[PDB]
Nucleic acid binder design. Sequence first.
DNA 1: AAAAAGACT
DNA 2: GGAAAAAT
Length: 471
Amino acid sequence: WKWWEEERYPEGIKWKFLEHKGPVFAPPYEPLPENVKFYYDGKVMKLSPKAEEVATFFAKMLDHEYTTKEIFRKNFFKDWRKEMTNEEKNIITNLSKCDFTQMSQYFKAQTEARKQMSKEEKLKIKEENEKLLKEYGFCIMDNHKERIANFKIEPPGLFRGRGNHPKMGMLKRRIMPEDIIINCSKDAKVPSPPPGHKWKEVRHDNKVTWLVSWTENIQGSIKYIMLNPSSRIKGEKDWQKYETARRLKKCVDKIRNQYREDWKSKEMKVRQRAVALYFIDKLALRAGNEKEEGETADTVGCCSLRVEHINLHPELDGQEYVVEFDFLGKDSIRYYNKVPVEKRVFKNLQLFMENKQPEDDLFDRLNTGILNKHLQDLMEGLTAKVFRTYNASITLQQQLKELTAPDENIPAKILSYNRANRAVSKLNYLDPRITVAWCKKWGVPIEKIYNKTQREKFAWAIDMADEDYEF
DNA sequence: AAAAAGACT
DNA sequence: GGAAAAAT
């Protein structure tokens, strides 16, 4: 089936009709058998089916760098004084006096017990967990049925937040049928609520891409259940994401000359604007919005950058005007680059960190809003992220034009694809139509690069790219 | 105008 | 996307 050849639904409504089967929770918590333990301060303590539940989550992560983490322990003591009784929490004054050891041989033996299940016992219940995929896994829509990406609801556990996240090790409780909000049309066969329980609400909102959604008890953010990346609704948005990058190509020349001029400006917020835009163009940086200090980890993007984050050198490693970026981005991954800049920029940068304490911001009169509000005036649909998608793709066009040998053989061209793929992260940002434009200009089978799963997401690109598709 | 809340690499 | 479980 092809959706790119059919008529496109304009801005507003995201689906004409929708009827989904509903979600799937974690099969009601299975209790601990008689033989398992819990040794406390010399003696032994007993556990309630609520505290016994939370117990199994710390068992599932004993020899992890998380247990030897101070903040993680601090939050497990707090969130645990809630998940038990008053008599149980009466004696307990230190976690250091606990032993999860008997549950640790158990958890480990339980992992190896599936490695003991036969070439028939591994299909007895393994076919049953696939009976779900057929029932609750697909959902009807406008044309045909689309596959749902994550029908199985987030099972309760702990928070595996990155780096030095202040809310790691908190009770991420079990989602009950009453926290759920179902979304589908008011002329459809609505999902029957699990025996005895109600839903939170039901909305017939056709302006959204989601089917089901609940709220996270930890941070207060809403988590959704959407479709498979194969879908019209999940694909047309990525098609549009690349189409947005296409409409940029010509207007780029003007943007660079535009901000390059804004360097020798007369005002604060204006001179500030341009510098940032230079980094997001060159460095391939992210924006970094207003973060909640005390809610999340201390990461920084471009707008959220601080004084302490940049070190500036006039002459370094034979190069003039160098800026040394030292910070932790998304997923707490440290970004380090000794990047050489232009004269005017270095000079502009100097002027910011001019009587300022290290703990304060770098970009005084500037945030993401002012950045994106500017970018919108310049073009329709243009946002800070578009640069990461533009730069990364236009490279591949110029790379996939010279690195391929004409009178070459088999892999002497695929050795050039990975060479261009090395020229920087793979999965996103790159336009599949450039990769497919090259596969017909020269003639390389798609099954060799992209597997069955990947040939599912780029399905639109396969059927709409020829031997001369220039970006 | 700014904050919060919603949604969709 | 990243981590981690599952497919001689």
